[PDB]
Amino acid sequence: RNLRVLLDTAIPPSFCDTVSSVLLDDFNMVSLIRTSPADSLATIKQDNAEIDIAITIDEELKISRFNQCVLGYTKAFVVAHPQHPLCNASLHSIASLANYRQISLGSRSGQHSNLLRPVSDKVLFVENFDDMLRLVEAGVGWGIAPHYFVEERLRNGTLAVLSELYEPGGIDTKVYCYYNTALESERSFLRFLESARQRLRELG
Amino acid sequence: RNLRVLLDTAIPPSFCDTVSSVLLDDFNMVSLIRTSPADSLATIKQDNAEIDIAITIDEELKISRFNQCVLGYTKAFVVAHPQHPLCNASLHSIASLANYRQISLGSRSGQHSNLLRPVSDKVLFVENFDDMLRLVEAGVGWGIAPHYFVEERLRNGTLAVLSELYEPGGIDTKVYCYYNTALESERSFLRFLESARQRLRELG
Ligand SMILES: CCCCCCCc1cc(=O)c2ccccc2[nH]1
Ligand SMILES: CCCCCCCc1cc(=O)c2ccccc2[nH]1
């Protein structure tokens, strides 16, 4: 009995180490699959992907063949080159973010949800977060990326934060867990959440 | 110069005491207005309401004449009569919540956002949270209400919680602050957030 799991690129590696660790105690065949958060909800809807669990930040409660629950929380920031014109982080900057270029991720389906849809009118899409930060480091525009994708570049001064005025301490983001309805009965999955969650709580 | 503020019924009174307290230090005319969270985003869009600040949990970033920011967090639960059939709180209960009657709030505009839209197909609307809990205490159905609306009834056993399986510790919910673009310049508003937030942080 194989178990195909989905972890988007927005899941920090700490979360990743916790998921894989537990599943191996009861399940003996686990397939980890990485996807862009814009393509997470899309790939699980595919009838042929046969995805059994998915751990993404994207929001969509009414999904067929799937339930929803929360695993933990994680921070994300609005980054930009330290010399970007909007570097002032002013209240007018938070509002005029929709007037400058944003570097959001591209959806293989061309569709974005309310959470991940680009907020700005001038947008430039990319494939993964790696390609985003490169363009952001070059002052091309601003974007929203996880904390672990940016923790290093900030201490090096390579990037600057602008969301503090919007949400201090970073944009707390929910990490949902979509699980096939067939697993709601098997107690092996029950033990997974109680363990995966209790460990993520120890992080903070 | 009058200042019309909007606090939905989902804002716990602790949040309410903090908002009113600060505004009186710099502003000398403040009008507090309460609304149903389903009618919060709707009343600010009214050209005649002339609302200057709004503090609600409802999500809608692309609003004309308004910006957005986060003030704090608050918990909400899925409540039900302790003898409700779904009292088991099982994984099948969290999924079958869409099959039983829900007691959600009614929108004066008839429209609900992604956050507040009733998740279940069998729905029964009400005007405020007071009318919800009454019906919930009578085993009519389940609903989602703030923590301060339910903190008393739980210790009395009058209600039971079901969201622990979905999100332990309660459904952490963001409390946004919509402020008119005209206030982004006045430093009086700047001092409000830095004060309103720093105090809400002391709560937890
Ligand atoms: C000031 C910005 C508005 C608030 C952000 C909107 C929600 C949101 C949009 C994102 O692309 C994103 C990307 C990675 C992690 C979380 C994210 N969350
Ligand atoms: C298992 C339930 C799904 C998650 C809840 C959906 C979001 C949500 C829906 C609500 O009506 C609500 C009411 C008051 C405070 C917060 C709320 N939040």
The experimental technique used to determine this model is X-ray
**CA distances (Å), A49 to each of A4, A33, A72, A157, in order?**
9, 11, 25, 41
Count CA atoms within 13 Å of residue B131 on its CB side: 10
Distance, CA of B66 to chain centre: 19
CATH topology of domain B1-204: D-Maltodextrin-Binding Protein; domain 2 (3.40.190)
DSSP class of B107: P
Alpha helices in A46-147 (DSSP H): 91-96, 129-137
CA of B163, closest atom in ligand 2 = 1
Residue B3's Cα: distance from chain center in Å? 21
Angle, CA of B73, B79 and B85, to the nearest 5°:
150
Q: Report the 10 Å Cβ neighbour count for A61.
A: 14
Contact present, B107 and B37 (Cβ < 8 Å)? no
B167 to A94: CB separation less than 8 angstroms, yes or no: no
User: By the 8 A CB rule, do B127 and B105 touch?
Assistant: yes
* In the block, residue with structure tokens 């703030």: B146
Query: Nearest CA to CA, how far is B120 from chain A (Å)?
Result: 10
φ, ψ for residue A43, nearest 5 deg: -75, -30
A172 at the B interface (CB within 8 A)?
Answer: yes
Residue A89 in contact with partner chain B when CB distance is under 8 A: no
- b/e string for A157-174 if b means 16 or more Cβ within 10 A? eebbbbbebbbeebbebb
| Angstrom distance (rounded) from CA B6 to CA B101 | 30
What's the CA gap between B177 and B68, in Å, rounded?
A: 6
List the domain boundaries for chain B: 1-204
Residue of chain A whose Cα is closest to the Cα of B89: A184
Distance CA B187, CA B182 (A): 11
- Chain B positions in Cβ-Cβ contact with residue A114 (cut-off 8 Å): 59, 114
- Cβ neighbours of A65 (radius 10 Å): 12
Q: Are B79 and B159 in contact (CB under 8 A)?
A: yes
Question: Is the Cβ–Cβ distance between B79 and B12 less than 8 Å?
Answer: no
B166: chain A residues, CB-CB within 8 Å: 68-70
- Residue B167 contacts A where some CB pair is shorter than 8 Å: yes
Phi, psi dihedrals of residue A78, rounded to the nearest 5°: -95, 105
Interface residue B182 vs chain A (CB under 8 A) = no
| Residue position matching structure tokens 């969650």 | A197
- Which candidate, B151, B167, B150, B126, places its Cα nearest to that of B38? B126
Distance CA A170, CA B200 (A): 16
Residue with the nearest Cα to atom 9 of ligand 1?
A: A116
Q: How far is A156 from chain B (nearest CA, A)?
A: 27
- For the record, the structure tokens of B172 come out as 């952490």
| Residue ranges with strand state E in A10-147 | 30-35, 53-56, 66-67, 70-80, 143-146
B69: nearest CB among A92, A166, A189: A166
Contact between A69 and B167 using a beta-carbon 8 Å cutoff:
yes
CB distance B56 to B49 below 8 Å: no
- Ligand 1 within 6 A of A148 CB? no
